[PDB]
Amino acid sequence: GGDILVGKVTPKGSDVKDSSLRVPNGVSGTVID
Amino acid sequence: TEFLKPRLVDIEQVSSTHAKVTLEPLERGFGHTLGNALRRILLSSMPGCAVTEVEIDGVLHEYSTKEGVQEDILEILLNLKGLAVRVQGKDEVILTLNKSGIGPVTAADITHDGDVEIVKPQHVICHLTDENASISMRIKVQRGRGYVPASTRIHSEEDERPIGRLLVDACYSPVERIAYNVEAARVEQRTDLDKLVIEMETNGTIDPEEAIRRAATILAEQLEAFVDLR
Amino acid sequence: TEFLKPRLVDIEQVSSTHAKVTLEPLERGFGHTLGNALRRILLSSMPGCAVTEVEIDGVLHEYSTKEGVQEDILEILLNLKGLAVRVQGKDEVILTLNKSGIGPVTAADITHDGDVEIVKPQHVICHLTDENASISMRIKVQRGRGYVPASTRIHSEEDERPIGRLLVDACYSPVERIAYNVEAARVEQRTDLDKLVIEMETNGTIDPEEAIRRAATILAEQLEAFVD
Amino acid sequence: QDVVLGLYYMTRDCVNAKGEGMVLTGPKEAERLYRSGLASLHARVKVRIT
Amino acid sequence: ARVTVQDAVEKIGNRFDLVLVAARRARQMQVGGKDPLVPEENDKTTVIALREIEEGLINNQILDVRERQEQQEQEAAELQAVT
Amino acid sequence: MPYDENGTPVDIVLNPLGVPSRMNIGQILETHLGMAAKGIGDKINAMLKQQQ
Amino acid sequence: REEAVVWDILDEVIREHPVLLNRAPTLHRLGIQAFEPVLIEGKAIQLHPLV
Amino acid sequence: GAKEAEIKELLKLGDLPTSGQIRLYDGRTGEQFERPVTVGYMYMLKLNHLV
RNA sequence: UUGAUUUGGUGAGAGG
């Protein structure tokens, strides 16, 4: 939980941000596909 | 104080794994005490070696499949978790299994070193079906006690290992089943003495008199806190 | 492959015959091992001495009645069983008590030799209604270990004792009650450990930690053979 | 539910057990006779209680 | 330590005023300035308040007496500091 | 775990008090018949391990 | 990050601080009761049986 | 289904006691549970209500 | 001054 899977963030959205889909809180696992 | 002391008089091996052992002579009432204490210690706290990290070539995660085999990779990891190894000198060794050709992959195909002994030469792991298929796994055998699982060993491991090493759970205890019996001892002048017939069932890797000696030392060093301090 | 040795953290001494040995921390499933081993040894194996046989005049079996007393001979047998005596040199001492006059008979009233003594002299024996009543009992004290009751004592005996001899349960072991719990302690990472709380109440003649140390060295000398 | 079964099995009686009709100097040695293996949990007995 | 507050309910017999008196006291110990009237066994201000109540040395009257004493001390401090 | 005299621990302990109230007595016959099924399995495992 | 020192902090904020346990169909007032926490290795609320 | 006498007869083919009940000792105290208990194999399922 | 969208609403199924 709290990892990063797909870096997916825009500029002009300092003013840049973190929408990068991460792993939900409490889950683990192995990326199978 | 008219007490006595017991000794390991006869140690019979019914097989290579299932093996009983006597204890003689015990005092009156002590039989169930020593039997239950040695049962709890001999089931909880024995050291035995087991499979910890499995490294197959060309396989990323454990939920994939491989070319030329029957069992899937989770089946291979379960059949490797059942393995019974007996190292002598080191406490952490790396074996090697390489095999090609149609037919099952026994545990007797691992290219052993000198100080490792694989005591189950009919333990099946894979069923290679293609003659052009190969499998080259590199196992890692630690040594500990109890049960330490993959989740806790996901951050506990300090030695920064590289990615690609499948983590297998560690079933370290080589004792699986133990029963004791308090018979009537055949003492030529005493009738109020008894014997303890401990019936162990091991993983084949542990020597029963050595196991009983280690469990006795564990119990004595635990009771030294009662003996010395108050 | 290294094991956790504990520290004995507490002896909450409630009375002179009471203790509570709080003890932490042990490996998971070791508190029950130590507690049960000590409990069985302290119940049925700890050596000591108490009253076994008593010969009283005026009675012929355990269901008769002497005059001059409020209580009956079952009560004198029970209050005799409650008496805690210690013998130093020998192991088969016969004692005799004689009491007359208005008042109860206590443990200090007995005639004692140089080798025996009473740990509780104000422990009551009986009470006397008549000033002309002269009670007399020949109290024999053996020395064994643990507990043997009068039922299997009379089942095990076969020699015809003289009429007037009375059997009693032989509370040889000096402890009266031992009962523990296992609680859960915490070393900063692993919460799976467990803490022992041994409670103990004895009679006189010993200090509960002395009984615990005696049982522990009994088991250690019992297991002293096949260790490294 | 479990605890009333444990009590109903504990405080009951049967017409013969180990230690039928023996006499006990207190409840402490009643539990000591139950634990050592010399009487049964339900065996009728004269005790001295206070 | 604390399991039941029954003696504290006995000495302040309303069971709804116990909460208010012990809350006034535990605010006197938390922010608070004041130090407790009782030895503390690493109990929190709640249990130290109720433990003061059980031995009969804090109720509503004692707290109003102490606050009048502090108001008089502040009055004497203001008068003796200025004049 | 509660082990029988043969030495094997029992795996899972349920509660008998559910059975007189919730009148699902079929789990007991499943328990006894599954015990008999593994009794035959242990007997075949002996006859085939100690190989005949 | 949950370092090694916040669990002692947690056992020092729990100690005398009750919590309100509540079963979801609360019908009478005995369905909200306040306990003191004892920390559990696990993910399930351990609830005293008589209650 | 299977009647009860066939359960008893199948428990006699295996070497098990006919009542379905085995005496069990306790792993903590090493001493026998009074009044023999029922041991058998029930087919237990894990439902997808995970904690 | 150092970051972001379901609640909204429907339907279906499930737990106690």
Coordinates of C-alpha atoms (C1' of nucleotides) in Angstrom, one line a residue, chain A residues 13-14 17 19, chain I residues 2-5:
Chain A
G13 CA -3.2 21.0 -13.2
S14 CA 4.7 23.6 -7.9
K17 CA 0.2 17.3 -8.9
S19 CA -3.0 11.7 -9.7
Chain I
rU2 C1' 3.0 22.2 0.4
rG3 C1' -2.3 17.9 -3.0
rA4 C1' -7.5 16.1 -5.0
rU5 C1' -13.4 14.0 -6.3

